[PDB]
Amino acid sequence: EDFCSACNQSGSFLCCDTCPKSFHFLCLDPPIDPNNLPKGDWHCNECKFKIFINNSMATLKKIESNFIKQNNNVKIFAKLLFNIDSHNPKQFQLPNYIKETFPAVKTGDENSIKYDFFDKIYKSKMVQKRKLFQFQESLIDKLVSNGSQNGNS
Amino acid sequence: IMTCDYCQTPWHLDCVPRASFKNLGSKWKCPLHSPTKVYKKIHHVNYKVWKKQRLINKKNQLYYEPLQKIGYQNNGNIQIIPTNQDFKITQIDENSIKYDFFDKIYKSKMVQKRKLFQFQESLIDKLGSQNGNSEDNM
Amino acid sequence: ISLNEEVTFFEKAKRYIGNKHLYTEFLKILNLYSQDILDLDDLVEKVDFYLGSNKELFTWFKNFVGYQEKCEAFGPSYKRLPKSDTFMPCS
Amino acid sequence: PKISLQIPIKLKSVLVDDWEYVTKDKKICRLPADVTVEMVLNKYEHEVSQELESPGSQSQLSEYCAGLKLYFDKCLGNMLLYRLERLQYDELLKKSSKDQKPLVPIRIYGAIHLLRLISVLPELISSTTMDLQSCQLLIKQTEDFLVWLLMHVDEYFNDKDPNRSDDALYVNTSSQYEGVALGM
Amino acid sequence: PKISLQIPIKLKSVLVDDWEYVTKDKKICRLPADVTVEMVLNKYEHEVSQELESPGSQSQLSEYCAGLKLYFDKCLGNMLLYRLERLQYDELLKKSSKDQKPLVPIRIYGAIHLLRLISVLPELISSTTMDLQSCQLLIKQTEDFLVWLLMHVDEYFNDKDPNRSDDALYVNTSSQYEGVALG
């Protein structure tokens, strides 16, 4: 092609052999200065993903299912981290929905688990306490101009 | 002593009060085995019924491990991970059940404390001079 | 501290229940309560069959969930008939 | 269907106006920024922690918060940057290489880049295979996150003491630099 | 040859439960049900008529609803009743003659009995001699009905204990009704 998918415009190209699509050097996930070029292939991230898994679904599901189980620390951001390596880099594009609202447009270990369980319980306790306490000081403040207890226990 | 038909955990005929061996009618479900049918009173129909999903053939069954650790609505169907098919058995980590059970408990305790504290504050709301004698109390 | 037990209640429960196959059912029962399928009183009654002997532990569990002590008791033998069939006459 | 995420109306202006500056004024943020992604996001893990009483609610907070620190790292070099920004990003890698210390996007960049990630977020879940229930939560902290942002949107998104150029998040750059940013 | 009908699992799990209540629990469904085979098809024919635009398919839909009613009347007597329910069917015939009105099964029996007819439709199709293009015509059309039935499974098939609700679709059987029906 003539345009760079990640510059969204016509650029001097480093070309992956397998995929006809080619990209401008600037938008390189790892910067790849023209002066220093990789040897011949320059496989794009999307192409590098296929050859890595060898275009196999079972491993893909497996290497995924391994990736989620590995990142038990942050599970909710598992599929998102897994996908981001495969996709080729792309320029930041202000999404349409945020644009569409505006009328005008200008440019177009084992102990760790117990510790991880313990601190959340411990952090929960004061929150439980301070909310219960603040209701109590609302009770003393319900008595006007002075606390009913007149002091702090 | 008799043994469960599913568990194979021996029980005295005294401990589970039990009159006899029950070797004719149906397999004896030992106590200590999860419920397969639950009648819940809504406390406001008077009741709601929950029945465990029947076990599907092996191939048609789909086991799923959700991305959300805490608070996934299992609907009562579970396979315990060591650490149109809408009939999917959610796979839950054991550490998740600890968080879920504790999450439910702590929320209820906050609500129970709120209602009790609100009601005591409510009688103050219905109240020239308070005359509650709280200053005397210490 | 009071937190020390709670962060270890499942460890203390795991040791007593012994074999895993019984511990799994203990987790499934604990699940049904957290899914609002199983009432609190029914949960404590089922846990009794697990942790009945460890009085110091079961008492703590009863304290934790907030269980307070002190129709649907149909019985297994008898089943209800529909309203229509009860009309067969007696002179 | 398509994932519905609601940006606060002022925050929508913040991003849309900000995109105007980079394309037209060609300004670039001073990096490392005045307000790093970390202390903005680490602080969120702190205040909201003292508000949630449940054990799980404390876990989900640190869960989503720590993940965003991880997600921003991989997703910076891929998507969040502009054409002009990408030229400025390239230097950093050499600068990190010259020190040999690994480049850590989260500590260096500002919070506005984090806001850029959230805008692109609902499209990203669409490509993923998460069921609805998991997607709900990913969104539910996200919406509740931006509800925080409005409280301090004036501090660091909005120009506080705007007279000084340093307070302004993005600073104007030379035209010959922009020529390299074009690449042709 | 052999005809395959994809019944959604939830509907395939209902039937099995129906097979359990009538043969093991020995309870039968209250025959004059609230959602009978007639209004079930009346609603489905009415909900889908507006949905589809092409008049050609509306003819295909309406006859499959009109046909399924006529077939159900002939079919219920022969092969849609478990043994324990035969007597209850008989008392309806015996009541019909005294009431001097002929029994029409679509007016009486519930949606579950319609599902029984759908379950044995492939076996009934294979027995006869039909055009192949009509075999996929019925099965595709039925598979479209079962999908619609899945979306409304909640308010046709509700699991209520007969001892308790008394509005449950199934009612227990007296020791005298069971004796004659089985004996």
UniProtKB/Swiss-Prot annotation, chain C:
Subcellular location: Nucleus
Domain PAH: 1-68
Domain of life: Eukaryota
Chain's role: Catalytic component of the RPD3 histone deacetylase complexes RPD3C(L) and RPD3C(S) responsible for the deacetylation of lysine residues on the N-terminal part of the core histones (H2A, H2B, H3 and H4). Histone deacetylation gives a tag for epigenetic repression and plays an important role in transcriptional regulation, cell cycle progression and developmental events. SIN3 also has a RPD3 independent function required for normal longevity.
Misc note: Present with 1660 molecules/cell in log phase SD medium.
Subunit structure: Component of the RPD3C(L) complex composed of at least ASH1, CTI6, DEP1, PHO23, RPD3, RXT2, RXT3, SAP30, SDS3, SIN3, UME1 and UME6. Component of the RPD3C(S) complex composed of at least EAF3, RCO1, RPD3, SIN3, and UME1. Interacts with ESS1 and STB1.
Record protein name field: Transcriptional regulatory protein SIN3
Native source organism of the sequence: Saccharomyces cerevisiae (strain ATCC 204508 / S288c)
